[PDB]
Write a structure and sequence with these properties.
This is part of a larger assembly, with 2 copies of chain A.
Chain A lengths: L29 H4 L18
Protein name (chains A, B): Major capsid protein
Amino acid sequence: ADISRAEVATLIQEAYSDTLLAAAKQGSTVLSAFQNVNMGTKTTHLPVLAT
Amino acid sequence: ADISRAEVATLIQEAYSDTLLAAAKQGSTVLSAFQNVNMGTKTTHLPVLAT
């Protein structure tokens, strides 16, 4: 007639560790690759040479 | 061939002017012709001579 781990219920109690939890985060590529134009209205018109 | 006003495109911008925008706001006539009475509750009783 043994005493099992199951028979010692919650006198044995689990620990917790956050060591795997943290995750690094990556921004937009296009915000660093190219010029960020500040806008003050929904639309801006840019003329370009066409012929 | 010639350069049309459409083919200059957005090099011809379009302008703005708020000179027609402003309109006056008008108060209540009765709220300035007559006495404004304070109230602390929905109903007030005023006794008057009747006969």
